[PDB]
Amino acid sequence: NQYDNDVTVWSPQGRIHQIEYAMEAVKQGSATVGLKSKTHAVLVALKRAQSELAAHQKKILHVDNHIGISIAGLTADARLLCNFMRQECLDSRFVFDRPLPVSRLVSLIGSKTQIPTQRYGRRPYGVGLLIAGYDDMGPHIFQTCPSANYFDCRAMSIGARSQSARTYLERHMSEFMECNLNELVKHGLRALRETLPAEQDLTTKNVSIGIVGKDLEFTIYDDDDVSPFLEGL
Amino acid sequence: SYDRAITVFSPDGHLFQVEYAQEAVKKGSTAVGVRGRDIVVLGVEKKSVAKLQDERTVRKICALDDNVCMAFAGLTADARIVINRARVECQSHRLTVEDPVTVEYITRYIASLKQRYTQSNGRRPFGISALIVGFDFDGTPRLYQTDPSGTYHAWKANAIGRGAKSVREFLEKNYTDEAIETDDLTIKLVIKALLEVVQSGGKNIELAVMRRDQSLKILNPEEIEKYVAEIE
Amino acid sequence: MEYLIGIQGPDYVLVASDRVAASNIVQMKDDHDKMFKMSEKILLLCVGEAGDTVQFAEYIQKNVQLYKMRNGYELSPTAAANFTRRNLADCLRSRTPYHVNLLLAGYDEHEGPALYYMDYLAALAKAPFAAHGYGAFLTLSILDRYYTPTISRERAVELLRKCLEELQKRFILNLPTFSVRIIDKNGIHDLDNISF
Amino acid sequence: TQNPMVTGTSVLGVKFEGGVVIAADMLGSYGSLARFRNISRIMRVNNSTMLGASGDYADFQYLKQVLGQMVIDEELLGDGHSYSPRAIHSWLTRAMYSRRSKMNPLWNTMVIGGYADGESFLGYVDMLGVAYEAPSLATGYGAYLAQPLLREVLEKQPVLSQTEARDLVERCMRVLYYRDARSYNRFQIATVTEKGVEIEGPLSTETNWDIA
Amino acid sequence: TTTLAFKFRHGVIVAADSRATAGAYIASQTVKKVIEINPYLLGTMAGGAADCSFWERLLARQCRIYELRNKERISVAAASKLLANMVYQYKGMGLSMGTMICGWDKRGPGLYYVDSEGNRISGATFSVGSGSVYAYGVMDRGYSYDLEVEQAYDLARRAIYQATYRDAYSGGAVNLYHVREDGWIRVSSDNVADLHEKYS
Amino acid sequence: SRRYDSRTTIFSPEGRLYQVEYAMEAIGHAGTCLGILANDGVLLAAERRNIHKLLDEVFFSEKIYKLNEDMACSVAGITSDANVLTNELRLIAQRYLLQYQEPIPCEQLVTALCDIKQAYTQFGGKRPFGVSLLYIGWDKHYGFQLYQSDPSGNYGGWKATCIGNNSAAAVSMLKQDYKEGEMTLKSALALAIKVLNKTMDVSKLSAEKVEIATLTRENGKTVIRVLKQKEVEQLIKKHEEEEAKAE
Amino acid sequence: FSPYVFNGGTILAIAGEDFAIVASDTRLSEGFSIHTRDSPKCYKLTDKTVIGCSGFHGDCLTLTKIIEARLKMYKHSNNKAMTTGAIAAMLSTILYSRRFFPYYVYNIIGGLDEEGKGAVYSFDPVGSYQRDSFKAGGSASAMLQPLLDNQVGFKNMQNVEHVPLSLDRAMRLVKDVFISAAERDVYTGDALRICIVTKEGIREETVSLRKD
Amino acid sequence: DRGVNTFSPEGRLFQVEYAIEAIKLGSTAIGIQTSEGVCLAVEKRITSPLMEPSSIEKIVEIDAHIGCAMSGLIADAKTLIDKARVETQNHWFTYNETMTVESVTQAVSNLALQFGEEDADPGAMSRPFGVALLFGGVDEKGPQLFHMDPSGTFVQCDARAIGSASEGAQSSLQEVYHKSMTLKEAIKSSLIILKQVMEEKLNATNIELATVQPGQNFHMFTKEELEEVIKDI
Amino acid sequence: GYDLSASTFSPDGRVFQVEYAMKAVENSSTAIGIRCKDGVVFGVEKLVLSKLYEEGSNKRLFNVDRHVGMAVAGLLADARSLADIAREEASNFRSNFGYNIPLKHLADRVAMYVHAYTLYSAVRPFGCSFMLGSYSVNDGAQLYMIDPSGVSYGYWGCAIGKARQAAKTEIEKLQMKEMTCRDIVKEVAKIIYIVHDEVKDKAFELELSWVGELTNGRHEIVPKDIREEAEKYAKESLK
């Protein structure tokens, strides 16, 4: 009653309701799926039908040539957070002339996201990000939360009804590290399809695919480009 | 620095401090402006004369520039901040454009300032409305009205203050091209509209008329009784 | 250098200025107003560095016009000259000083005619007659010679004409035309340009 | 640094097949005074990067703690990402360039050597942010007195061995002791390989022949 | 560098040369020195080339912001005052400029010389640049206000021509523009080596 | 913190400013202060509050506070907040003299304080100054003047007005025994004592309970002169006797 | 302390009907010496744009880091690559943003325009900005521009047919004019990178010049 | 009682949730993107007959190629449509190119959710914007049309109605729109739907129409031009 | 309403926002650290929530300097914030004094940063306790622990987390003062498994890191050849 309006107020249970309510903002957005093999890292997202006449969203963003993100939650907090991530990746290539490592970008997010969770009159970033990457250490599926810790994932899905995808992903995660590129994306499409109503299916108009790889920069795939990936599902 | 959101939204999408600043306008003295063919007439309704006013310094029709003059209703102290900040902008515009302002320019400056205190931290909105009259360089007369929300519209005739719901109902049934034809008949259109709102009646109003170059002059008290006797 | 001259009479503040806007060797403009009216009854005659003479004079003009809007009455010439001195003096040690040499002239309904001198080092002085520029050297002794404090305004134009004929014969710059205007009690009247 | 105070002189550097060798003498001059005769002007940056600098030795000790602690900070989080020798050369290019634009330069003239991913890196950085890479480097009067000897060997034979590059290093350091007034008869040789940076001890040019 | 502008009855003719030179070595001879600002107003480039071409581009975006906010095109008076105020903030810092804003407003044809020294003055005729003194003479003999359109084209080409013939830093091709009441038009780009065959 | 804030500068749902209207009631229980404009001067007649037997007589007045060579004020409300305002008017009066070398016109001094007072009713989150205060003065443009300035930040020029306790009863007596364009100074001193009897609940006056200052012109120089104890005791006795000759 | 050094280098963009050819030497200098013999002044920006940068090499390294960083900022916020004329307009504002401590870099943009024709944009170090058909910049620019204005502009030729410049006649005209530049300019002559920009991408050649 | 940066237990961020309810009190605006141009049609909602209807500028120029249509609190739009105009001129200044319709929408919607009351600026927004904006124009990708909800969520739409009668005009836009209709057939379709939803009698005074073609610039219809269209309905 | 701010005492003199923030540590899994004769060994019961997380995500053992390690427990985003604060203090010490920061001083500089958020309504207290541990030749082995109140005490063994009291009884019967670091790792893994609940919180990955004389005073993760030889030892005595 009186412990949920401010982010600087602990409840008597050792718990901050304003942080947990911002994590409710990412569980009611749209389902996005991220997963990786030993060679690639794939972000698949549902471009959500706002109406029957809207070109739906854009929910996968370019960050660097080796890192792209996928958005669940408030979209204006996302690109406010993505413009920080784009600047932090330009900051390294200007200074070190090398790609900034994926595990160090997400550590800069979680230290920038923790700061509004502790000062008065500031709100948590109501956005979850699945982050695909290819560093010198391989592929990476970092998930970040409004509760500013982050998670190196083998595969992860966030958004509305995304537990059905995590039910799917945790079953078939035993075979992700030995897939082809077209085989790995189709696992993410079958995970993304699990988050759909029974009257709905994965068209080419509502699916974006973001792939990053070894000899492949990060690319998003539009409506006509997801047709070679949906040709088997 | 006092940084706290004073004007916030409410359920059903209302800004309470903007709505409550408009209730401060409705508790103020009634101001009427109509727009003629080559004449704009502002008239305010002095509620009390009291025989002890130095009336020179509670006049509610100011003069923003030589071509622009306004009349307000609402919190008198909030108006004097708006009147003075419009007068500074009318002089900065002569500095940079080498031309007098248009009436819609200083209306946009007053409205965007009034919008700014509905959205900045640590500020309440202005509790005034402003009937702004003037003339372009082309000579077209203008009549504008700003609200505490920061919204401004052009008007053929308008009324702000107390009783303005009844004065605007009067002017919407009596503003025609025939009553806006003669310059003296335009002046009696404000005086007829004010006398419907002045609950005590008589020569207890203030009224200023601005024609073209050889500009604005506020009418004297015996020069206003000549019109009120011509409408008795 | 450009040329200013003012002659205070009993009820007028006759001023004149050259109308040239010279550059390196060529001159650009031959009808150049160096007079800036501030009220209905006061003028500011401004010469000096390039650009400073309008960035200062229009700044003084916009605040003296703002004074009339805020208050309903105009400044006096003494208060306008003192206002003009303040924001010329507190900027002479700033990052951006103004190198303007001024000649403020005005009529007051109760104090009368008033002519003011000030230089780029912001020293205000009320004078019966004053002049600026290199041409002041040749003309301030025409005016120490034939000026009386009770001079008519017809004899002030005729005394002004003696000073401007002295510049035609003895001064090396080409200053052919001069804007001349009076500041009697009825405001500012543009007299005919004394040309050569 | 508007004016340098204690300067080092020429720093050599040449890459070979399997690594890079740099060399600098152990001396800092206060204006034709051999004042500090035992200072090492070669920094081991990390396991695959070495660094030697000419110019102001106080500005080089500033770079040894700013770049040295930057190597702590990457090694704390322990994710397996190290600075390459060309990442350090690019950071140090941006560090020296940002200082001349505030007109407060670091006076030094670093030579960065390194060996990462099977490839030898040798990089120059000047105090104006002028940076490049070369098979052989020499700063100071070594660019006049040793760089002609380095390039005449690297033109006939673009790949050296380790024993052959070290002998070429000592042969150019002997010429610097003969003909540079700010040079000194003791020098450090550092060598990066696949097995890490190894800075050998005080070597002399004590085989100096002077037929007068 | 020689730029030229005069007002006459049928608008204002703007003319310039094309030579941009660093020291005594001609860097280019196809320099568009008549900077068109927007479809109704335009300037010239005399002085530092990057200074005249930046601040008249920054003038160009503030005239467009003025046109969007006020729903009317800016005057020649207000445009020259905005340019004078922007370059006054860098007085004594090294802006080499000196330019002529041209156009029609409600007041008719307008021509205002604006310098980075701080000047902005009205006038019928102006000429800016190093060969401006050679262009002043040929202009002032031929100039009239009641000058025909083909006549005003002729003496503005020739005044730039005589300036290129005497100024080492003036050359290239003339670039004649004409401001009419419905915006400026570009009328000719005659080469100086081609005008020499006509003028002799 | 939003919990501890009181929101001093917001609107009421009726369109009111509470802290302004609550500052207005601090003044209605302060010392009664009135001012009367005459044809050759303006006066102030403050009812003295600090009338204890063991008070000293340090500085020139109790509630007058001369502002300028040519104008003085008089305060009623919070005593401490009035001292902050009167230092501020003296700064504005001397910044005008520094900038123009002419004395501040009296309407332009009241306007500048009323901008500082309005600014604490609109932004900053502070309480307003609970000081309404009168003004008497002379200037070139309109001569003798009289102003009143509420804590709202709005002011007015008056011929006769009154602030403080029983101000509403004092104004109505000034509506009837004041004549416009017909009040001399000596007639206005007698009107001041007449109002300060029916608006002070005590049996009579004693001149230890009032303070009077007049502002006149003498040979081109404004003099502001607090009347001494014998000068007011003669005015009390001229009204305590003349009331017996009217009943 | 001077914040500048002239590092030499000459750059040679040439526009054609369906191509652009940006060329440079590879010698880096300071004073009377040679830093390295393989340092190209040419930099690929997009799929159809090459910049050539000569002057102060500390500013040349910084400016191409800034352009390559602001190439990406456009692509992030506008979701398309920059056109050749928009890079050259952006560089005009980057060079003027640092005007009271300016870059000592002569820049030539060469690429394909938005209609598939060749586009060459020339720059003063403070951002004066002109589209040409051919431009030399740098140390030998006074040597190269009279031959380019002879053999491309067809100037001072009487009764000669203005043939369209082919791809091969332009490439020989590039190579033959640096042979004339390396003969008499001391700052040019190590090698010659030619970045040639067509519809199929950016081919990049090299050919030797006379070592000093 | 609660601050401006406070999430609902549903994760909705209250002040934005109430700024969306402010749009439903503003007049109805319609946009239709066709392949031959976009059209923007808005109800003016004349309050009094004495009000001059030429001052109700609910459609504005952003650049020559972009026009915007607003609904909600018209005073709040004037700071967004001035930041729209300055951003197009800053893009033209730097890049000598017209700014695309998506990136103007992306720049304006970054100002939504940039509010707060804890040192967000010396002058910062206390509250979100109570406006929806329909950007519409022709870029290098052709005719485009964008929506700008106060959450900073921007979406490309083929046809979109906003305002007090959007839920009911968006039901009418989904029935009559198709991907090959003409701009003349879209202007006419934007007035049958305004006829259903306006309270007063629809004439050429209480509507405001403007189109952006690929050939011509932005232009707003005159009084004489609107009279031809209303007779066709 | 005496518990909505950190600038408010209770009527019996308690700051509940501090005491609520240490309930957040008590809802986190148990991390222990044992100071022995040769060094300090940390051990974290790291609850892995989903099977979808990679082995090593949400790491609880930090390196704050090359000789100091940090085992955290509590709100993990606050823990990574204080790890950056402890890295900055250890960095600024070497940039101002030229040697490795003592663990006494580093623990006191960070505990006074934590204390600084227990005083104002503008911030909340940190929701994490954390142990620090280092080894030097001169200073020896040292283990300090910092609470969300900002109090730092030196320990021979600390056991922050859920099973705080249950792990302290296992550390108290150990006699760590004479045992070496390779013997403590076999015992830390025993204490982690005996306090883990195999009913409430299901999956968990043991994280172990020492700092001691065998590493020349460097803090590092215990290697998998020694880690697996202690997890096998811990299950054999769990029976």
mmCIF file with all atom_site columns, C-alpha atoms in Angstrom, chain H residues 16-83:
data_model
loop_
_atom_site.group_PDB
_atom_site.id
_atom_site.type_symbol
_atom_site.label_atom_id
_atom_site.label_alt_id
_atom_site.label_comp_id
_atom_site.label_asym_id
_atom_site.label_entity_id
_atom_site.label_seq_id
_atom_site.pdbx_PDB_ins_code
_atom_site.Cartn_x
_atom_site.Cartn_y
_atom_site.Cartn_z
_atom_site.occupancy
_atom_site.B_iso_or_equiv
_atom_site.pdbx_formal_charge
_atom_site.auth_seq_id
_atom_site.auth_comp_id
_atom_site.auth_asym_id
_atom_site.auth_atom_id
_atom_site.pdbx_PDB_model_num
ATOM 1  C CA . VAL H 1 16 ? 1.773   8.045  -19.619 1.00 0.00 ? 16 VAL H CA 1
ATOM 2  C CA . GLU H 1 17 ? -1.329  5.893  -19.075 1.00 0.00 ? 17 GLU H CA 1
ATOM 3  C CA . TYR H 1 18 ? -3.211  9.084  -18.207 1.00 0.00 ? 18 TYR H CA 1
ATOM 4  C CA . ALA H 1 19 ? -1.660  11.091 -21.023 1.00 0.00 ? 19 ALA H CA 1
ATOM 5  C CA . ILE H 1 20 ? -3.160  8.502  -23.378 1.00 0.00 ? 20 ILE H CA 1
ATOM 6  C CA . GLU H 1 21 ? -6.584  9.193  -21.853 1.00 0.00 ? 21 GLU H CA 1
ATOM 7  C CA . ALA H 1 22 ? -6.040  12.887 -22.619 1.00 0.00 ? 22 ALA H CA 1
ATOM 8  C CA . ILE H 1 23 ? -5.943  12.169 -26.362 1.00 0.00 ? 23 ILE H CA 1
ATOM 9  C CA . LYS H 1 24 ? -9.453  10.669 -26.262 1.00 0.00 ? 24 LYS H CA 1
ATOM 10 C CA . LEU H 1 25 ? -10.746 14.162 -25.420 1.00 0.00 ? 25 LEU H CA 1
ATOM 11 C CA . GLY H 1 26 ? -9.135  15.737 -28.497 1.00 0.00 ? 26 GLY H CA 1
ATOM 12 C CA . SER H 1 27 ? -10.627 15.989 -31.959 1.00 0.00 ? 27 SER H CA 1
ATOM 13 C CA . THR H 1 28 ? -10.431 13.221 -34.523 1.00 0.00 ? 28 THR H CA 1
ATOM 14 C CA . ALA H 1 29 ? -7.524  13.113 -36.988 1.00 0.00 ? 29 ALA H CA 1
ATOM 15 C CA . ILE H 1 30 ? -7.224  10.660 -39.877 1.00 0.00 ? 30 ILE H CA 1
ATOM 16 C CA . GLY H 1 31 ? -4.184  9.659  -41.898 1.00 0.00 ? 31 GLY H CA 1
ATOM 17 C CA . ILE H 1 32 ? -4.083  7.341  -44.916 1.00 0.00 ? 32 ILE H CA 1
ATOM 18 C CA . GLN H 1 33 ? -0.872  6.222  -46.625 1.00 0.00 ? 33 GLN H CA 1
ATOM 19 C CA . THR H 1 34 ? -1.325  5.350  -50.287 1.00 0.00 ? 34 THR H CA 1
ATOM 20 C CA . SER H 1 35 ? 1.365   4.603  -52.836 1.00 0.00 ? 35 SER H CA 1
ATOM 21 C CA . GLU H 1 36 ? 0.621   7.934  -54.557 1.00 0.00 ? 36 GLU H CA 1
ATOM 22 C CA . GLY H 1 37 ? 0.760   10.097 -51.428 1.00 0.00 ? 37 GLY H CA 1
ATOM 23 C CA . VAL H 1 38 ? -0.460  10.478 -47.860 1.00 0.00 ? 38 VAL H CA 1
ATOM 24 C CA . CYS H 1 39 ? -3.430  12.502 -46.652 1.00 0.00 ? 39 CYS H CA 1
ATOM 25 C CA . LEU H 1 40 ? -4.046  14.070 -43.250 1.00 0.00 ? 40 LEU H CA 1
ATOM 26 C CA . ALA H 1 41 ? -7.579  15.065 -42.266 1.00 0.00 ? 41 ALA H CA 1
ATOM 27 C CA . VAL H 1 42 ? -8.590  16.405 -38.853 1.00 0.00 ? 42 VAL H CA 1
ATOM 28 C CA . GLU H 1 43 ? -11.758 17.674 -37.198 1.00 0.00 ? 43 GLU H CA 1
ATOM 29 C CA . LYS H 1 44 ? -11.347 21.260 -36.041 1.00 0.00 ? 44 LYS H CA 1
ATOM 30 C CA . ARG H 1 45 ? -14.114 21.112 -33.366 1.00 0.00 ? 45 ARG H CA 1
ATOM 31 C CA . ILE H 1 46 ? -15.382 24.684 -33.605 1.00 0.00 ? 46 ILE H CA 1
ATOM 32 C CA . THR H 1 47 ? -16.404 25.685 -30.089 1.00 0.00 ? 47 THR H CA 1
ATOM 33 C CA . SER H 1 48 ? -17.973 29.097 -30.789 1.00 0.00 ? 48 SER H CA 1
ATOM 34 C CA . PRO H 1 49 ? -19.166 30.750 -34.019 1.00 0.00 ? 49 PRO H CA 1
ATOM 35 C CA . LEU H 1 50 ? -17.088 33.822 -33.173 1.00 0.00 ? 50 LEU H CA 1
ATOM 36 C CA . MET H 1 51 ? -13.907 31.725 -33.177 1.00 0.00 ? 51 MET H CA 1
ATOM 37 C CA . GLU H 1 52 ? -11.997 32.314 -36.398 1.00 0.00 ? 52 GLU H CA 1
ATOM 38 C CA . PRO H 1 53 ? -11.402 28.781 -37.753 1.00 0.00 ? 53 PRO H CA 1
ATOM 39 C CA . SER H 1 54 ? -8.188  29.703 -39.604 1.00 0.00 ? 54 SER H CA 1
ATOM 40 C CA . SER H 1 55 ? -6.290  29.656 -36.286 1.00 0.00 ? 55 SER H CA 1
ATOM 41 C CA . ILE H 1 56 ? -7.043  26.016 -35.423 1.00 0.00 ? 56 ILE H CA 1
ATOM 42 C CA . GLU H 1 57 ? -3.797  24.682 -36.879 1.00 0.00 ? 57 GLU H CA 1
ATOM 43 C CA . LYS H 1 58 ? -4.061  20.979 -36.116 1.00 0.00 ? 58 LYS H CA 1
ATOM 44 C CA . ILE H 1 59 ? -1.991  20.214 -39.234 1.00 0.00 ? 59 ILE H CA 1
ATOM 45 C CA . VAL H 1 60 ? 1.463   21.775 -39.581 1.00 0.00 ? 60 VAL H CA 1
ATOM 46 C CA . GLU H 1 61 ? 4.450   21.740 -41.889 1.00 0.00 ? 61 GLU H CA 1
ATOM 47 C CA . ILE H 1 62 ? 7.471   19.957 -40.496 1.00 0.00 ? 62 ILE H CA 1
ATOM 48 C CA . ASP H 1 63 ? 9.555   20.313 -43.632 1.00 0.00 ? 63 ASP H CA 1
ATOM 49 C CA . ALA H 1 64 ? 8.524   20.689 -47.267 1.00 0.00 ? 64 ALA H CA 1
ATOM 50 C CA . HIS H 1 65 ? 8.101   16.913 -47.467 1.00 0.00 ? 65 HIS H CA 1
ATOM 51 C CA . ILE H 1 66 ? 6.685   16.099 -43.999 1.00 0.00 ? 66 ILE H CA 1
ATOM 52 C CA . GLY H 1 67 ? 3.415   17.248 -42.491 1.00 0.00 ? 67 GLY H CA 1
ATOM 53 C CA . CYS H 1 68 ? 2.110   16.366 -39.055 1.00 0.00 ? 68 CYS H CA 1
ATOM 54 C CA . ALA H 1 69 ? -1.405  15.933 -37.692 1.00 0.00 ? 69 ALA H CA 1
ATOM 55 C CA . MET H 1 70 ? -2.113  16.302 -33.986 1.00 0.00 ? 70 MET H CA 1
ATOM 56 C CA . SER H 1 71 ? -4.817  15.498 -31.480 1.00 0.00 ? 71 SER H CA 1
ATOM 57 C CA . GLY H 1 72 ? -5.101  16.003 -27.754 1.00 0.00 ? 72 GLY H CA 1
ATOM 58 C CA . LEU H 1 73 ? -3.582  19.004 -25.999 1.00 0.00 ? 73 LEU H CA 1
ATOM 59 C CA . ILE H 1 74 ? -2.621  21.256 -28.932 1.00 0.00 ? 74 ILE H CA 1
ATOM 60 C CA . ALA H 1 75 ? -0.393  23.422 -26.749 1.00 0.00 ? 75 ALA H CA 1
ATOM 61 C CA . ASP H 1 76 ? 1.767   20.397 -25.906 1.00 0.00 ? 76 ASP H CA 1
ATOM 62 C CA . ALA H 1 77 ? 2.275   19.662 -29.593 1.00 0.00 ? 77 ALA H CA 1
ATOM 63 C CA . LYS H 1 78 ? 3.855   23.051 -30.314 1.00 0.00 ? 78 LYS H CA 1
ATOM 64 C CA . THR H 1 79 ? 7.027   22.090 -28.458 1.00 0.00 ? 79 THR H CA 1
ATOM 65 C CA . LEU H 1 80 ? 7.136   18.748 -30.283 1.00 0.00 ? 80 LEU H CA 1
ATOM 66 C CA . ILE H 1 81 ? 6.439   20.144 -33.744 1.00 0.00 ? 81 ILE H CA 1
ATOM 67 C CA . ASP H 1 82 ? 9.052   22.841 -33.193 1.00 0.00 ? 82 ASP H CA 1
ATOM 68 C CA . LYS H 1 83 ? 11.606  20.230 -32.185 1.00 0.00 ? 83 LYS H CA 1
#
